[PDB]
């Protein structure tokens, strides 16, 4: 279940953003819609979908059996194809296109409002759950470098009937 990860990166001459995959990267400071199927060719590396608790979707053949090639293999894709959590697994997804742009599809977990639960001006960036906060998941720093200074809190969020205990990154 690590083979599944899609790992195609080019090129890092400009920014060395790629390092972000392994550890914190010296990004320059400061520069700071449905979901279906994405080909594994343009994906480096992990794809994060939110329920809204963050979840990892690995490569699978279309459709839908999992592939343990690093994608790599041409058939490898990510099947998202999803509907909001009352009732669905996730609101939206974020990943990195191979050149190092961040691709977001679907909608942020905040969207439940309504209103006033999403950020004040609405969104180009991130899985917000609060005008000030977004979800914290292991590749957030890599996906959203601007959030490096964000404080982290333990947070309850209720979707439909289910209750999610999740970590949040706030201003």
């Amino acid at each position: 279940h690590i083979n599944s990860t899609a790992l195609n990166c080019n090129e890092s001459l400009n920014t060395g953003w790629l390092a972000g995959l392994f550890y914190q990267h010296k990004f320059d400071s400061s520069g700071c819609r449905p979901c279906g199927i994405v080909p594994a060719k343009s994906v480096c590396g992990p794809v994060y979908c939110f329920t809204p608790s963050p979840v990892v979707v690995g490569t699978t053949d279309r459709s839908g059996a999992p592939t343990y090639s690093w994608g790599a293999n041409d058939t490898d894709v990510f099947v998202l194809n999803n509907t909001r959590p009352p009732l669905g697994n996730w609101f939206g997804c974020t990943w990195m296109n191979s050149t190092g742009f961040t691709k977001v599809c679907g909608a942020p977990p905040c969207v439940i409002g309504g209103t006033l639960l999403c950020p004040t001006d609405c969104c180009g960036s991130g899985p917000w759950i609060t005008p000030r906060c977004m979800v914290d998941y292991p590749y957030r720093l890599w996906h959203y470098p601007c959030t490096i200074n964000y404080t982290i809190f333990k947070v309850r969020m209720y979707v439909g009937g289910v209750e999610h205990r999740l970590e949040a990154a706030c201003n």
Epitope: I2, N3, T5, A6, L7, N8, C9, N10, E11, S12, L13, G16, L18, A19, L21, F22, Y23, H25, C44, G45, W70, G71, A72
Partner: antibody
Framework: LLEQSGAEVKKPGSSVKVSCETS????????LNWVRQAPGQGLEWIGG????????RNAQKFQGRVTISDDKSTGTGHMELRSLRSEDTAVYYC????????????????????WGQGTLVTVSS | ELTQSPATLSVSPGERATLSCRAS??????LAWYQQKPGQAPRLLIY???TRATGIPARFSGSGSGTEFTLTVSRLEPEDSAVYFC?????????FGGGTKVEIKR
């Protein structure tokens, strides 16, 4: 800042184990590669490993035997080469890389940032 | 798959020493220049064909793309007495250049 194991002599067909240590360790390195240098000829790439994915990659001349293990705990690298040849006699460099430029997958590619002291491996009876 | 020319260079201090690297197959910008001083391990001079590494003086200057590369040492100092190598990180097998030995004239 990268220290390698002391020079060794082994009979043809035997095995060598060369280590690597970092003082002070451990820093952010994503890949551990090895590059040997025969006195007659220029540098030759042996192989490498990215410890985060556990994916190894070698060259045709060493495809069968060599295994490179990178321990992240103590930041200690290891290259073991078995069934040595007379042309295997060279100065073996331990090299580590920070900042990838390309990933085929699993393996990642980048320039070599830090080299080791070098280890003279002598294959002689 | 890398050809460094010339094999041997000899040049006065304060003058420019240029080294050519030619790949048999295109390697885009995935080329790196290293310096090997007598009895020491190689030092990373340039990566990405023309990007200087940290701590390397501006007199060192990488150039070129595709199959065609050149390394420039503008203001030579006796410390530059070393053998310089080129190495590509593009194609499946990693390859080094033959290596150019640089002699400082005095």
């Amino acid at each position: 800042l990268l220290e390698q194991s002391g020079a060794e002599v082994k009979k043809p067909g035997s095995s060598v184990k060369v280590s690597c240590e970092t003082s002070g360790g451990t820093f952010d390195n994503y890949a551990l590669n090895w590059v040997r240098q025969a006195p007659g000829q220029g540098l030759e790439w042996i192989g490498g490993v990215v410890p985060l994915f556990g994916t190894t990659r070698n060259a045709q001349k060493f495809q069968g035997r060599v295994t490179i293990s990178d321990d992240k705990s103590t930041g200690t690298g290891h290259m073991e080469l078995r069934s040595l040849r007379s042309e295997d006699t060279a100065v073996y460099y331990c090299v580590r890389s920070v900042t990838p430029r390309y990933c085929g997958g699993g393996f990642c590619y980048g320039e070599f940032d830090y080299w080791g002291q070098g280890t003279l491996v002598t294959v002689s009876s | 798959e890398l050809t460094q020319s010339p094999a041997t260079l000899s040049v006065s201090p304060g003058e420019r020493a240029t080294l050519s690297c030619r790949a048999s197959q295109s390697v885009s910008s995935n080329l790196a220049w290293y310096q090997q001083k007598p009895g020491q391990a190689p030092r990373l001079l340039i990566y990405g064909a023309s990007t200087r590494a940290t701590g390397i003086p501006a007199r060192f200057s990488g150039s070129g793309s595709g199959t065609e590369f050149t390394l420039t040492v503008s203001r030579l100092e006796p410390e530059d007495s070393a053998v310089y190598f080129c190495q590509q990180y593009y194609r499946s097998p990693l390859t080094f250049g033959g290596g150019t030995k640089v002699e400082i004239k005095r």
